[PDB]
Amino acid sequence: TALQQAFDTCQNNKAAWLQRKNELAAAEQEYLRLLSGEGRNVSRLDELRNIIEVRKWQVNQAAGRYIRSHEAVQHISIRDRLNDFMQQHGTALAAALAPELMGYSELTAIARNCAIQRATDALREALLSWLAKGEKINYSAQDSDILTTIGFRPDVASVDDSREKFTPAQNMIFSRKSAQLASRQSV
Amino acid sequence: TALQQAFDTCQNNKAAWLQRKNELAAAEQEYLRLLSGEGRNVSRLDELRNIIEVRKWQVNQAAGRYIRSHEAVQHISIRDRLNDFMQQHGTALAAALAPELMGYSELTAIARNCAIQRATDALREALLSWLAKGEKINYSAQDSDILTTIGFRPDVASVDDSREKFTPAQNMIFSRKSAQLASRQSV
Protein backbone atom coordinates (compact mmCIF):
# COMPACT_ATOMS: atom_id res chain seq x y z
CA THR A 1 0.00 0.00 0.00
CA ALA A 2 3.01 2.26 0.53
CA LEU A 3 3.65 2.25 -3.22
CA GLN A 4 -0.02 3.12 -3.71
CA GLN A 5 0.36 5.91 -1.13
CA ALA A 6 3.28 7.40 -3.04
CA PHE A 7 1.40 6.94 -6.32
CA ASP A 8 -1.64 8.89 -5.11
CA THR A 9 0.65 11.51 -3.55
CA CYS A 10 2.28 12.06 -6.94
CA GLN A 11 -1.12 12.03 -8.67
CA ASN A 12 -2.53 14.78 -6.45
CA ASN A 13 0.73 16.73 -6.80
CA LYS A 14 0.32 16.47 -10.58
CA ALA A 15 -3.30 17.62 -10.30
CA ALA A 16 -2.27 20.60 -8.16
CA TRP A 17 0.46 21.52 -10.65
CA LEU A 18 -1.99 21.24 -13.56
CA GLN A 19 -4.59 23.45 -11.88
CA ARG A 20 -1.86 25.94 -10.91
CA LYS A 21 -0.66 26.19 -14.51
CA ASN A 22 -4.26 26.54 -15.71
CA GLU A 23 -4.80 29.43 -13.29
CA LEU A 24 -1.50 30.97 -14.42
CA ALA A 25 -2.55 30.72 -18.07
CA ALA A 26 -5.94 32.27 -17.28
CA ALA A 27 -4.25 35.14 -15.43
CA GLU A 28 -1.81 35.67 -18.32
CA GLN A 29 -4.55 35.73 -20.96
CA GLU A 30 -6.63 38.12 -18.84
CA TYR A 31 -3.60 40.38 -18.41
CA LEU A 32 -2.83 40.42 -22.13
CA ARG A 33 -6.45 41.07 -23.11
CA LEU A 34 -6.64 43.93 -20.60
CA LEU A 35 -3.37 45.33 -21.96
CA SER A 36 -4.80 45.19 -25.48
CA GLY A 37 -7.70 47.29 -24.23
CA GLU A 38 -7.66 51.08 -24.30
CA GLY A 39 -8.09 51.35 -20.52
CA ARG A 40 -4.99 52.54 -18.68
CA ASN A 41 -5.61 51.00 -15.21
CA VAL A 42 -1.98 51.27 -14.09
CA SER A 43 -2.76 49.85 -10.65
CA ARG A 44 -4.69 46.98 -12.24
CA LEU A 45 -1.82 46.07 -14.57
CA ASP A 46 0.70 46.29 -11.72
CA GLU A 47 -1.36 43.99 -9.51
CA LEU A 48 -1.90 41.62 -12.44
CA ARG A 49 1.86 41.53 -12.99
CA ASN A 50 2.35 40.69 -9.31
CA ILE A 51 -0.34 38.01 -9.54
CA ILE A 52 1.17 36.36 -12.61
CA GLU A 53 4.65 36.46 -11.06
CA VAL A 54 3.53 34.81 -7.82
CA ARG A 55 1.43 32.30 -9.79
CA LYS A 56 4.38 31.30 -11.97
CA TRP A 57 6.48 30.93 -8.81
CA GLN A 58 3.75 28.67 -7.42
CA VAL A 59 3.74 26.68 -10.67
CA ASN A 60 7.52 26.23 -10.44
CA GLN A 61 7.24 25.11 -6.81
CA ALA A 62 4.46 22.66 -7.69
CA ALA A 63 6.58 21.27 -10.53
CA GLY A 64 9.51 20.82 -8.16
CA ARG A 65 7.30 19.06 -5.61
CA TYR A 66 5.95 16.81 -8.36
CA ILE A 67 9.51 15.98 -9.44
CA ARG A 68 10.43 15.12 -5.85
CA SER A 69 7.32 12.97 -5.42
CA HIS A 70 8.03 11.15 -8.70
CA GLU A 71 11.59 10.47 -7.56
CA ALA A 72 10.31 9.26 -4.18
CA VAL A 73 7.75 6.87 -5.69
CA GLN A 74 10.30 5.50 -8.16
CA HIS A 75 12.81 5.04 -5.33
CA ILE A 76 10.34 3.24 -3.05
CA SER A 77 9.25 1.00 -5.93
CA ILE A 78 12.91 0.21 -6.67
CA ARG A 79 13.71 -0.55 -3.04
CA ASP A 80 10.66 -2.79 -2.56
CA ARG A 81 11.24 -4.70 -5.81
CA LEU A 82 14.92 -5.19 -4.98
CA ASN A 83 14.12 -6.33 -1.44
CA ASP A 84 11.51 -8.88 -2.47
CA PHE A 85 13.48 -10.21 -5.46
CA MET A 86 16.73 -10.53 -3.51
CA GLN A 87 14.86 -12.28 -0.69
CA GLN A 88 13.53 -14.70 -3.31
CA HIS A 89 17.06 -15.11 -4.70
CA GLY A 90 19.33 -14.53 -1.71
CA THR A 91 21.56 -17.56 -2.23
CA ALA A 92 22.14 -16.95 -5.95
CA LEU A 93 22.99 -13.26 -5.60
CA ALA A 94 25.17 -13.94 -2.55
CA ALA A 95 27.10 -16.71 -4.31
CA ALA A 96 27.53 -14.55 -7.42
CA LEU A 97 29.85 -12.26 -5.42
CA ALA A 98 30.63 -14.66 -2.57
CA PRO A 99 34.45 -14.18 -2.18
CA GLU A 100 33.84 -10.62 -0.93
CA LEU A 101 31.07 -11.33 1.61
CA MET A 102 32.46 -13.60 4.33
CA GLY A 103 33.91 -11.75 7.30
CA TYR A 104 31.79 -8.66 6.58
CA SER A 105 30.35 -8.61 10.11
CA GLU A 106 33.70 -7.98 11.84
CA LEU A 107 35.39 -6.21 8.92
CA THR A 108 36.81 -2.75 9.58
CA ALA A 109 34.78 0.24 8.42
CA ILE A 110 37.24 1.36 5.73
CA ALA A 111 37.65 -2.20 4.44
CA ARG A 112 33.87 -2.72 4.63
CA ASN A 113 33.26 0.38 2.51
CA CYS A 114 35.98 -0.62 0.05
CA ALA A 115 34.51 -4.13 -0.29
CA ILE A 116 30.96 -2.91 -0.89
CA GLN A 117 32.27 -0.33 -3.39
CA ARG A 118 34.13 -3.12 -5.19
CA ALA A 119 30.92 -5.16 -5.27
CA THR A 120 29.04 -2.19 -6.75
CA ASP A 121 31.77 -1.73 -9.37
CA ALA A 122 31.56 -5.44 -10.20
CA LEU A 123 27.81 -5.07 -10.74
CA ARG A 124 28.54 -2.00 -12.89
CA GLU A 125 30.10 -4.10 -15.65
CA ALA A 126 27.20 -6.58 -15.57
CA LEU A 127 24.81 -3.66 -16.01
CA LEU A 128 26.99 -2.30 -18.82
CA SER A 129 26.94 -5.66 -20.61
CA TRP A 130 23.16 -5.92 -20.19
CA LEU A 131 22.61 -2.45 -21.65
CA ALA A 132 25.07 -3.22 -24.46
CA LYS A 133 23.00 -6.27 -25.40
CA GLY A 134 19.99 -3.94 -25.38
CA GLU A 135 17.20 -6.42 -24.68
CA LYS A 136 13.66 -5.06 -24.55
CA ILE A 137 11.91 -5.29 -21.18
CA ASN A 138 9.01 -3.79 -19.22
CA TYR A 139 8.34 -2.98 -15.57
CA SER A 140 7.87 -5.54 -12.80
CA ALA A 141 4.81 -7.75 -13.15
CA GLN A 142 3.45 -7.13 -9.65
CA ASP A 143 3.32 -3.32 -9.97
CA SER A 144 3.28 -2.86 -13.74
CA ASP A 145 0.14 -0.70 -13.68
CA ILE A 146 1.49 1.80 -11.14
CA LEU A 147 4.83 2.16 -12.92
CA THR A 148 3.14 2.60 -16.30
CA THR A 149 0.78 5.24 -14.90
CA ILE A 150 3.61 7.12 -13.18
CA GLY A 151 5.57 7.17 -16.44
CA PHE A 152 9.22 6.38 -17.04
CA ARG A 153 10.09 10.08 -16.87
CA PRO A 154 8.18 13.13 -15.62
CA ASP A 155 6.55 15.48 -18.10
CA VAL A 156 8.94 17.73 -20.01
CA ALA A 157 6.85 20.76 -18.99
CA SER A 158 7.75 20.19 -15.34
CA VAL A 159 11.39 19.69 -16.37
CA ASP A 160 11.62 23.05 -18.13
CA ASP A 161 9.56 24.84 -15.47
CA SER A 162 11.90 23.56 -12.73
CA ARG A 163 15.06 24.31 -14.72
CA GLU A 164 15.33 27.78 -13.17
CA LYS A 165 15.60 28.20 -9.40
CA PHE A 166 15.23 31.04 -6.91
CA THR A 167 17.28 32.25 -3.97
CA PRO A 168 15.82 31.48 -0.51
CA ALA A 169 15.11 35.18 0.05
CA GLN A 170 12.95 35.23 -3.07
CA ASN A 171 11.42 31.90 -2.01
CA MET A 172 10.26 33.33 1.32
CA ILE A 173 9.15 36.61 -0.29
CA PHE A 174 6.96 34.66 -2.70
CA SER A 175 5.70 32.49 0.17
CA ARG A 176 4.57 35.68 1.89
CA LYS A 177 2.99 36.84 -1.38
CA SER A 178 1.06 33.56 -1.61
CA ALA A 179 -0.04 33.83 2.02
CA GLN A 180 -1.29 37.40 1.58
CA LEU A 181 -3.07 36.63 -1.70
CA ALA A 182 -4.80 33.65 -0.07
CA SER A 183 -5.72 35.83 2.93
CA ARG A 184 -7.21 38.72 0.94
CA GLN A 185 -8.78 36.48 -1.72
CA SER A 186 -10.83 34.36 0.69
CA VAL A 187 -12.87 37.43 1.65
CA THR B 1 40.12 -19.72 -20.21
CA ALA B 2 42.32 -17.06 -18.58
CA LEU B 3 41.27 -18.32 -15.13
CA GLN B 4 43.68 -21.26 -15.38
CA GLN B 5 46.47 -18.93 -16.53
CA ALA B 6 45.81 -16.65 -13.56
CA PHE B 7 45.75 -19.66 -11.22
CA ASP B 8 49.11 -20.99 -12.40
CA THR B 9 50.57 -17.47 -12.33
CA CYS B 10 49.51 -17.20 -8.68
CA GLN B 11 50.95 -20.66 -7.98
CA ASN B 12 54.37 -19.87 -9.42
CA ASN B 13 54.33 -16.44 -7.75
CA LYS B 14 53.76 -18.19 -4.42
CA ALA B 15 56.57 -20.63 -5.19
CA ALA B 16 58.96 -17.79 -6.04
CA TRP B 17 57.90 -15.88 -2.91
CA LEU B 18 58.61 -18.95 -0.76
CA GLN B 19 62.00 -19.34 -2.44
CA ARG B 20 62.85 -15.70 -1.73
CA LYS B 21 61.67 -16.05 1.88
CA ASN B 22 63.75 -19.16 2.57
CA GLU B 23 66.87 -17.76 0.89
CA LEU B 24 66.49 -14.53 2.88
CA ALA B 25 66.14 -16.56 6.07
CA ALA B 26 69.28 -18.53 5.21
CA ALA B 27 71.20 -15.34 4.44
CA GLU B 28 70.13 -13.65 7.68
CA GLN B 29 70.90 -16.71 9.82
CA GLU B 30 74.36 -17.12 8.30
CA TYR B 31 74.99 -13.39 8.77
CA LEU B 32 73.95 -13.67 12.42
CA ARG B 33 76.15 -16.71 13.05
CA LEU B 34 79.11 -14.97 11.39
CA LEU B 35 78.46 -11.97 13.64
CA SER B 36 78.47 -14.27 16.67
CA GLY B 37 81.51 -16.10 15.28
CA GLU B 38 85.16 -15.30 15.87
CA GLY B 39 85.67 -14.13 12.29
CA ARG B 40 86.38 -10.42 11.85
CA ASN B 41 86.29 -9.99 8.05
CA VAL B 42 84.67 -6.57 7.74
CA SER B 43 84.40 -6.95 3.96
CA ARG B 44 82.44 -10.17 4.49
CA LEU B 45 80.10 -8.35 6.88
CA ASP B 46 79.53 -5.50 4.43
CA GLU B 47 78.85 -7.86 1.53
CA LEU B 48 76.46 -9.85 3.74
CA ARG B 49 74.62 -6.61 4.58
CA ASN B 50 74.38 -5.90 0.85
CA ILE B 51 73.02 -9.42 0.28
CA ILE B 52 70.48 -8.93 3.08
CA GLU B 53 69.21 -5.63 1.69
CA VAL B 54 68.99 -6.88 -1.90
CA ARG B 55 67.19 -10.04 -0.76
CA LYS B 56 64.76 -7.93 1.27
CA TRP B 57 64.05 -5.82 -1.81
CA GLN B 58 63.52 -8.97 -3.88
CA VAL B 59 61.12 -10.35 -1.25
CA ASN B 60 59.21 -7.07 -1.21
CA GLN B 61 58.88 -7.09 -5.00
CA ALA B 62 57.81 -10.75 -4.98
CA ALA B 63 55.14 -9.98 -2.39
CA GLY B 64 53.94 -7.02 -4.46
CA ARG B 65 53.62 -9.03 -7.66
CA TYR B 66 51.96 -11.88 -5.74
CA ILE B 67 49.39 -9.42 -4.38
CA ARG B 68 48.82 -8.10 -7.90
CA SER B 69 48.36 -11.64 -9.23
CA HIS B 70 45.98 -12.53 -6.39
CA GLU B 71 43.82 -9.46 -6.97
CA ALA B 72 43.87 -10.13 -10.72
CA VAL B 73 42.73 -13.74 -10.34
CA GLN B 74 40.05 -12.70 -7.83
CA HIS B 75 38.79 -10.06 -10.27
CA ILE B 76 38.75 -12.57 -13.14
CA SER B 77 36.84 -15.14 -11.07
CA ILE B 78 34.33 -12.51 -9.89
CA ARG B 79 33.84 -11.28 -13.46
CA ASP B 80 33.21 -14.80 -14.79
CA ARG B 81 30.83 -15.69 -11.96
CA LEU B 82 28.86 -12.46 -12.38
CA ASN B 83 28.78 -12.93 -16.16
CA ASP B 84 27.26 -16.40 -15.97
CA PHE B 85 24.94 -15.28 -13.16
CA MET B 86 23.56 -12.39 -15.23
CA GLN B 87 23.28 -14.73 -18.21
CA GLN B 88 21.23 -16.94 -15.88
CA HIS B 89 18.98 -14.45 -14.03
CA GLY B 90 19.56 -11.10 -15.72
CA THR B 91 16.06 -10.44 -17.05
CA ALA B 92 14.66 -10.27 -13.51
CA LEU B 93 17.51 -7.96 -12.48
CA ALA B 94 16.74 -5.65 -15.40
CA ALA B 95 13.04 -5.70 -14.52
CA ALA B 96 13.88 -4.79 -10.91
CA LEU B 97 15.63 -1.63 -12.20
CA ALA B 98 13.22 -0.89 -15.07
CA PRO B 99 12.16 2.65 -13.95
CA GLU B 100 15.65 3.90 -14.85
CA LEU B 101 16.63 1.62 -17.76
CA MET B 102 14.02 2.24 -20.48
CA GLY B 103 15.36 3.80 -23.67
CA TYR B 104 19.01 3.74 -22.60
CA SER B 105 20.20 3.90 -26.22
CA GLU B 106 19.09 7.49 -26.90
CA LEU B 107 20.02 8.87 -23.48
CA THR B 108 22.83 11.42 -23.41
CA ALA B 109 26.10 11.00 -21.51
CA ILE B 110 24.92 12.78 -18.35
CA ALA B 111 21.59 10.93 -18.34
CA ARG B 112 23.29 7.55 -18.84
CA ASN B 113 25.80 8.29 -16.07
CA CYS B 114 23.07 9.40 -13.65
CA ALA B 115 20.96 6.32 -14.42
CA ILE B 116 23.99 4.07 -13.85
CA GLN B 117 24.72 5.86 -10.57
CA ARG B 118 21.12 5.42 -9.40
CA ALA B 119 21.23 1.72 -10.31
CA THR B 120 24.48 1.35 -8.37
CA ASP B 121 22.90 3.04 -5.36
CA ALA B 122 19.90 0.70 -5.60
CA LEU B 123 22.04 -2.44 -5.77
CA ARG B 124 24.26 -1.08 -2.97
CA GLU B 125 21.24 -0.59 -0.72
CA ALA B 126 20.04 -4.10 -1.60
CA LEU B 127 23.47 -5.52 -0.75
CA LEU B 128 23.63 -3.68 2.58
CA SER B 129 20.11 -4.86 3.44
CA TRP B 130 21.20 -8.43 2.67
CA LEU B 131 24.37 -8.05 4.74
CA ALA B 132 22.41 -6.62 7.68
CA LYS B 133 20.85 -10.04 8.38
CA GLY B 134 24.28 -11.69 8.14
CA GLU B 135 23.20 -14.77 6.19
CA LYS B 136 26.31 -16.96 5.94
CA ILE B 137 27.21 -18.37 2.52
CA ASN B 138 30.01 -20.31 0.83
CA TYR B 139 32.06 -20.02 -2.36
CA SER B 140 30.67 -20.49 -5.86
CA ALA B 141 30.04 -24.14 -6.69
CA GLN B 142 31.70 -24.17 -10.12
CA ASP B 143 35.01 -22.65 -9.01
CA SER B 144 35.11 -23.44 -5.29
CA ASP B 145 38.44 -25.27 -5.46
CA ILE B 146 40.36 -22.33 -6.95
CA LEU B 147 38.93 -19.90 -4.40
CA THR B 148 39.78 -22.27 -1.54
CA THR B 149 43.33 -22.90 -2.76
CA ILE B 150 44.04 -19.18 -3.27
CA GLY B 151 42.42 -18.17 0.02
CA PHE B 152 39.93 -15.47 0.92
CA ARG B 153 42.81 -13.03 1.46
CA PRO B 154 46.60 -13.31 1.21
CA ASP B 155 48.39 -14.10 4.45
CA VAL B 156 49.90 -11.42 6.67
CA ALA B 157 53.43 -12.57 5.81
CA SER B 158 52.82 -11.40 2.23
CA VAL B 159 51.67 -7.89 3.22
CA ASP B 160 53.73 -7.15 6.34
CA ASP B 161 56.88 -7.05 4.20
CA SER B 162 55.03 -5.15 1.44
CA ARG B 163 54.06 -2.14 3.56
CA GLU B 164 57.29 -0.28 2.68
CA LYS B 165 57.35 1.66 -0.60
CA PHE B 166 60.51 2.33 -2.60
CA THR B 167 61.21 5.44 -4.63
CA PRO B 168 61.78 4.73 -8.35
CA ALA B 169 65.49 5.51 -8.06
CA GLN B 170 65.71 2.96 -5.25
CA ASN B 171 63.96 0.41 -7.47
CA MET B 172 66.37 1.09 -10.35
CA ILE B 173 69.51 0.83 -8.21
CA PHE B 174 68.21 -2.34 -6.54
CA SER B 175 67.50 -3.81 -9.98
CA ARG B 176 71.06 -3.01 -11.08
CA LYS B 177 72.46 -4.57 -7.90
CA SER B 178 70.32 -7.68 -8.40
CA ALA B 179 71.58 -7.96 -11.98
CA GLN B 180 75.16 -7.64 -10.72
CA LEU B 181 74.47 -10.31 -8.08
CA ALA B 182 73.07 -12.67 -10.72
CA SER B 183 76.02 -12.04 -13.04
CA ARG B 184 78.54 -12.64 -10.24
CA GLN B 185 76.79 -15.78 -8.93
CA SER B 186 76.34 -17.34 -12.38
CA VAL B 187 80.12 -17.66 -12.75
Author numbering:
A (entry chain e), B (entry chain f): 4 to 190
What does the paper say about this structure?
Phage satellite P4 polarity suppression protein, Psu, a building block of the viral capsid, inhibits hexameric transcription termination factor, ρ, by presently unknown mechanisms. The ρ hexamer adopts an NTPase-inactive, washer-like, open-ring conformation until NTPs (preferentially ATP) are engaged and RNA is bound at the SBS, leading to ring closure and RNA entrapment inside the ring. Our cryogenic electron microscopy structures of ρ-Psu complexes show that Psu dimers clamp two inactive, open ρ rings and promote their expansion to higher-oligomeric states. ATPase, nucleotide binding and nucleic acid binding studies revealed that Psu hinders ρ ring closure and traps nucleotides in their binding pockets on ρ.
Irrespective of the bound nucleotide, all assemblies contain two open ρ rings, denominated ρ(A) and ρ(B), that are laterally bridged by multiple Psu dimers, with the ρ CTDs facing inwards and the ρ NTDs facing outwards. In complex II, two hexameric ρ rings are bridged by five Psu dimers that connect ρ(A) subunit 6 with ρ(B) subunit 2, ρ(A) subunit 5 with ρ(B) subunit 3, etc. The different rotational orientations of the Psu-bridged ρ rings in complexes I, II, and III lead to different spacings between the innermost ρ subunits, which directly interact in complex I but are separated by a gap of ~ 30 Å and ~50 Å in complexes II and III, respectively. We further refined complex II (ATP; global resolution 3.8 Å), complex IIexpanded (ATP; global resolution 3.6 Å), complex III (ATPγS; global resolution 3.65 Å), and complex IIIexpanded (ATPγS; global resolution 4.25 Å). The ρ hexamers in complexes I, II and III exhibit slightly increased inter-subunit and ρ1-ρ6 rise values (8.4–8.8 Å and 42.2–43.9 Å, respectively). Psu subunits bind between two neighboring ρ CTDs across the nucleotide-binding sites. Psu helix α7 (residues 170–186) is placed in a cleft between the two neighboring ρ CTDs, covering the corresponding nucleotide-binding pocket. ATP or ATPγS are bound similarly between all neighboring ρ CTDs in the ρ-ATP/ATPγS-Psu or ρP167L-ATPγS-Psu assemblies.
